[PDB]
């Protein structure tokens, strides 16, 4: 609702999205490791 | 103005969550065809 609360919210979804990004770079490195 | 920049930021993170969904999907395919 209010711009600050919503600003927090957008921060938390961005740090969560960074942990998803992290997790995907991990799986890539893993399959990179299997293959090559 | 900040209500507008904030709506846009929300829609960006939404779309980005879809891109993530897709990279996770591709990883899953690959991995299921090596493991």
């Amino acid at each position: 609702s209010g711009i600050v609360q919503q600003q927090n919210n957008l921060l938390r979804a961005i740090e969560a999205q960074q942990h998803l990004l992290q997790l995907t770079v991990w799986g890539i490195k893993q399959l990179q490791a299997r293959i090559l | 103005g900040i209500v507008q920049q904030q709506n846009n930021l929300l829609r960006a993170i939404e779309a980005q969550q879809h891109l993530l969904q897709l990279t996770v999907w591709g990883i899953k395919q690959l991995q299921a065809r090596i493991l």
Binding site: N9, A13, A16, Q17, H19, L23 | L10, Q17
Partner: peptide, 23 residues
């Protein structure tokens, strides 16, 4: 250091987490 099951569980946890913060 991870298993693929635990990876999947973490992806699922953060996806629900974002998905709450966005609804």
């Amino acid at each position: 250091e991870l298993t693929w099951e635990e990876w999947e569980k973490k992806i699922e946890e953060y996806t629900k987490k974002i998905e709450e913060i966005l609804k």
